[PDB]
Amino acid sequence: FRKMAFPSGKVEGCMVQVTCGTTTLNGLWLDDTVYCPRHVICTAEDMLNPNYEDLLIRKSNHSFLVQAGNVQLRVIGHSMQNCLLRLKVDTSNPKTPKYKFVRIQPGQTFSVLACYNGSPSGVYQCAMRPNHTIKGSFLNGSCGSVGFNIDYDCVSFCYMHHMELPTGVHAGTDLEGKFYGPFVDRQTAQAAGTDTTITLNVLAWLYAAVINGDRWFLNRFTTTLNDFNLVAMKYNYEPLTQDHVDILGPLSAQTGIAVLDMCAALKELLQNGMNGRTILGSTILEDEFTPFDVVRQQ
Amino acid sequence: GFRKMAFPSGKVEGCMVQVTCGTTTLNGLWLDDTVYCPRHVICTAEDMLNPNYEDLLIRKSNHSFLVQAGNVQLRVIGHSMQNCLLRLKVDTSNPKTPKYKFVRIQPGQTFSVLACYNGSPSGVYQCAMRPNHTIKGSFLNGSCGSVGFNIDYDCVSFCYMHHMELPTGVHAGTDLEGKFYGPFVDRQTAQAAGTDTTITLNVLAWLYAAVINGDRWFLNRFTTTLNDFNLVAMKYNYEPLTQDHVDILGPLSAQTGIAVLDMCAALKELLQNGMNGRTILGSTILEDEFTPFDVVRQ
Ligand SMILES: COc1cccc2[nH]c(C(=O)N[C@@H](CC(C)C)C(=O)N[C@@H](C[C@@H]3CCNC3=O)C(=O)c3nc4ccccc4s3)cc12
Ligand SMILES: COc1cccc2[nH]c(C(=O)N[C@@H](CC(C)C)C(=O)N[C@@H](C[C@@H]3CCNC3=O)C(=O)c3nc4ccccc4s3)cc12
């Protein structure tokens, strides 16, 4: 069982470089639109608070240097959408795939194409956390990198990188420029809400461990959903919904362990702890491996 | 802020095709006017237990190879075996052919895998060639012919093509010249690898990664000689350290400011006293699938 990313070629054909003054970041080229974080226009204005509507009226189309590989693209118009700029260019991307813009929900995963200077350097898998952060790997120059999923040749773009919190996690927006979480694009230290554990995915991981022949943690206690949810919240675990219990159906049928019986297993692990025991090799319960991942890889 | 990252797969995705002989369908790699694929695409369910490839191949003509690149079908105009691969000559040269080389990777080195099913890429992940010449991959039915690769600049270095899953769940395959890594043969039999060991040079590089990411709890005032460390390493199934390895860890040592043999003393302490419930870079186990080169790049 291992975390896999979606193949990145459909997105690589869209990455570009957007430069204002001495500041440059990544943008996404779809048809005749380039999307990028709006703070490419900042010149130290980012410190404290920038007035984006003022900075933007003060900018000409010629001040935007947009480069796709070797080619410079002429900016024909610009308008601001939330925390993103939409740049109109004179040529439509010959490599635009079928795409949509989606708002990823907590607990769901996506692939990140980390880019620097409009050039992709790496691909990895991420989870949107309940507190609306992601545990990414992003260095200076990463802003504008996108997260995405791919279904039947259609790219679902769900994220654009904007910032790294003081704790080392990362924050950003969907492709309409709406931030995930309560963060704002200014140069300030910001704090995320307490980060809860994705219970649906821990449970999925437990199911994967049982499929792997590792079942020391099972027991014969019973729990109701309500009584499991009250214990889980005491340990900063997300409560389980009835939809989540359904999502776990195929895995519970495959192993013969009823979902609520696995909850009774997890409940004991929360209350008694691992005690040095290991699950799939780790003393830590993994929560970024989804039931879909377990299902596909079993 | 540190994780396994795979190379962007775009240059490789544009080379994946589908090769069919009768009921059997495998992935193939299309470079210039040649398609490479595992030779047991010519196998029926009855030839698999102990087939004679020379015999089975003399019995086929170019017409019996249906090669599909996406929608398009390419005509085979010639064929030949190279070890455990077939090389099919096609009438059209792949216009998406990247700059490339064929290399044979040595144990401990890492690469990216593009997992393909029915000629179409489905996932990408990073993995390393184990000391016992297997890879700990994620390969399902229909994955044979998927390739492993590294990218330097704009040149794809192909190093792996996938053939088989051992009963232990690890995987075996060949370089692009069709020569298998390890003691394995392409037959439908249960085969065993040698006993695996831990890649010491990679654990050390990962410990440097942790120090560079601000995880220094495991460090200690002590130091050890290479010989002393090796005696300890042998006890815990770790590859012996070599002076060349220490030279490879030169640059990491300089940035960190920690002498290599100091890091070894820390590792000796982690082997002997465990991690005490502590985690390094978010992991409860000593990661050994990051090379010194990988840590630098990130
Ligand atoms: C340590 O806590 C802090 C305390 C006090 C202040 C702090 N600010 C930030 C913060 O993150 N600022 C944002 C930018 C703001 C405007 C959203 C930022 O630098 N984003 C990066 C990606 C970051 C960097 C490392 N990996 C992450 O992904 C991005 O490449 C961009 N670069 C530039 C460079 C020039 C112009 C625009 C951009 S936009 C953290 C922080
Ligand atoms: C007594 O038999 C066993 C006993 C104990 C363990 C065992 N392992 C294997 C074994 O691996 N066989 C090879 C094939 C051999 C001949 C190279 C095989 O099926 N490879 C797969 C990838 C495999 C499949 C599951 N995940 C892995 O990645 C592959 O994608 C290919 N598929 C086909 C399908 C039809 C025709 C050709 C090919 S080539 C057999 C076996």
Side-chain angles (χ1 to χ4, degrees), chain A residues 1-44 49-61 63-64 66-69 71 73 75-87 89-97 99-139 141-150 154-177 179-233 235-241 243-274 276 278-291 293-295 297, chain B residues 1-45 48 51-60 62 64-65 67 69-70 74 76-88 90-98 100 102-105 107-151 155-212 214-220 222-224 229-230 233 236-241 243 245-246 249-254 256-267 270-272 274-275 277 279-296 298:
Chain A
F1 286 119
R2 148 207 296 291
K3 287 160 171 174
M4 302 182 7
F6 277 101
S8 69
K10 287 183 168 54
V11 184
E12 294 166 52
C14 302
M15 298 311 302
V16 303
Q17 217 187 8
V18 177
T19 304
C20 274
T22 62
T23 87
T24 299
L25 40 69
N26 309 290
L28 189 66
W29 186 19
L30 308 165
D31 319 314
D32 62 346
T33 311
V34 167
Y35 302 81
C36 69
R38 67 184 170 175
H39 34 108
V40 63
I41 74 196
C42 298
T43 77
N49 200 1
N51 187 319
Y52 284 107
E53 295 86 352
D54 291 353
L55 296 173
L56 183 58
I57 190 46
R58 296 189 178 116
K59 287 196 56 108
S60 66
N61 286 9
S63 46
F64 289 108
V66 176
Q67 315 176 82
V71 194
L73 295 185
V75 174
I76 266 47
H78 66 259
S79 75
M80 167 163 53
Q81 185 170 3
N82 298 319
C83 304
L84 296 198
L85 298 183
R86 318 180 90 149
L87 302 180
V89 291
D90 57 13
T91 47
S92 148
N93 189 349
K95 284 148 110 157
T96 309
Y99 69 103
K100 34 181 176 88
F101 290 166
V102 314
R103 184 124 180 128
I104 201 96
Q105 297 312 308
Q108 296 171 328
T109 58
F110 58 97
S111 301
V112 167
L113 182 61
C115 296
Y116 298 92
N117 312 301
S119 306
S121 80
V123 201
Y124 56 89
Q125 188 232 68
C126 261
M128 176 57 65
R129 311 285 316 164
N131 71 344
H132 311 110
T133 64
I134 71 189
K135 293 179 159 66
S137 180
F138 285 129
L139 305 182
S142 51
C143 296
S145 298
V146 292
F148 64 97
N149 287 296
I150 299 188
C154 178
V155 180
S156 279
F157 286 107
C158 64
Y159 178 98
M160 184 161 279
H161 182 51
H162 284 254
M163 148 194 298
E164 175 171 304
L165 298 195
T167 42
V169 303
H170 299 94
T173 72
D174 60 40
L175 261 298
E176 286 168 331
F179 260 100
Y180 280 102
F183 322 102
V184 298
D185 53 348
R186 338 191 204 289
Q187 190 80 354
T188 55
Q190 290 168 63
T194 287
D195 189 24
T196 55
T197 299
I198 301 152
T199 308
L200 178 59
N201 292 349
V202 169
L203 282 168
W205 199 61
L206 293 182
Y207 272 114
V210 166
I211 291 162
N212 215 247
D214 199 3
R215 43 163 84 214
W216 64 267
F217 47 84
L218 297 175
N219 63 51
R220 293 170 314 116
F221 297 125
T222 63
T223 188
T224 65
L225 190 55
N226 189 4
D227 287 346
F228 171 80
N229 280 348
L230 291 156
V231 170
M233 292 186 63
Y235 293 87
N236 272 331
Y237 269 54
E238 285 295 301
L240 254 200
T241 65
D243 309 28
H244 295 160
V245 174
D246 294 332
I247 286 168
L248 290 170
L251 219 32
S252 100
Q254 179 176 320
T255 59
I257 312 288
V259 175
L260 285 174
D261 284 333
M262 193 71 79
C263 291
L266 176 58
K267 179 196 275 187
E268 230 51 54
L269 293 168
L270 300 181
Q271 290 172 330
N272 306 345
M274 304 291 281
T278 74
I279 293 179
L280 288 172
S282 177
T283 72
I284 286 184
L285 301 179
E286 172 68 50
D287 87 338
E288 298 206 356
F289 212 59
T290 65
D293 296 328
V294 181
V295 154
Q297 294 179 33
Chain B
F2 191 89
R3 51 172 66 213
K4 301 274 181 60
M5 255 163 51
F7 282 107
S9 43
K11 287 167 171 52
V12 171
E13 293 172 50
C15 305
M16 293 317 299
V17 298
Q18 202 167 197
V19 189
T20 300
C21 280
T23 37
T24 304
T25 284
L26 299 193
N27 299 291
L29 185 71
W30 182 27
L31 299 169
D32 301 312
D33 67 322
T34 305
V35 165
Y36 307 76
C37 76
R39 66 182 175 170
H40 33 89
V41 64
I42 74 197
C43 280
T44 85
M48 290 172 76
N52 187 308
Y53 293 102
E54 229 78 62
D55 267 327
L56 277 160
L57 187 67
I58 196 159
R59 288 161 187 174
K60 303 197 46 119
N62 307 346
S64 41
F65 292 103
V67 176
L74 306 156
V76 185
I77 66 188
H79 63 268
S80 69
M81 196 165 275
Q82 176 161 28
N83 300 314
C84 302
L85 299 198
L86 299 170
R87 299 171 34 114
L88 308 175
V90 283
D91 53 27
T92 320
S93 161
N94 188 341
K96 299 182 270 247
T97 299
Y100 73 95
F102 289 172
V103 315
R104 189 165 173 90
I105 52 154
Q109 310 192 287
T110 61
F111 56 97
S112 297
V113 164
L114 179 73
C116 291
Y117 296 90
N118 316 296
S120 50
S122 80
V124 58
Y125 57 90
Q126 195 84 357
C127 71
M129 172 67 64
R130 308 284 329 160
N132 69 347
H133 314 106
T134 63
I135 65 167
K136 296 196 268 172
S138 179
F139 288 120
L140 294 166
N141 285 318
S143 54
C144 282
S146 296
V147 292
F149 61 94
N150 287 283
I151 306 182
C155 183
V156 182
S157 271
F158 294 101
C159 57
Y160 180 79
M161 184 171 272
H162 177 53
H163 291 253
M164 115 170 338
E165 187 170 292
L166 300 193
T168 59
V170 303
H171 300 94
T174 66
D175 62 23
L176 271 289
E177 263 143 26
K179 190 190 184 198
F180 255 100
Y181 295 103
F184 312 108
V185 292
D186 53 340
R187 290 197 301 204
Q188 186 91 345
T189 175
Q191 295 171 57
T195 317
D196 207 14
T197 68
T198 301
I199 305 151
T200 314
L201 168 64
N202 289 3
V203 181
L204 287 171
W206 183 67
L207 293 177
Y208 279 109
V211 169
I212 298 160
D215 246 12
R216 32 194 315 148
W217 69 264
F218 54 83
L219 284 186
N220 71 30
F222 313 118
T223 320
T224 186
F229 170 90
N230 282 329
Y236 294 87
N237 213 19
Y238 265 65
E239 281 186 321
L241 202 63
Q243 173 59 232
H245 291 168
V246 179
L249 287 164
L252 281 179
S253 190
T256 51
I258 303 170
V260 164
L261 289 170
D262 288 1
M263 202 55 89
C264 284
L267 174 56
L270 287 167
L271 289 181
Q272 287 179 359
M275 294 189 45
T279 75
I280 301 175
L281 282 173
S283 165
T284 70
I285 73 140
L286 307 175
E287 292 282 331
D288 79 341
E289 296 210 344
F290 294 100
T291 65
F293 178 100
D294 295 340
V295 173
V296 166
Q298 270 211 47

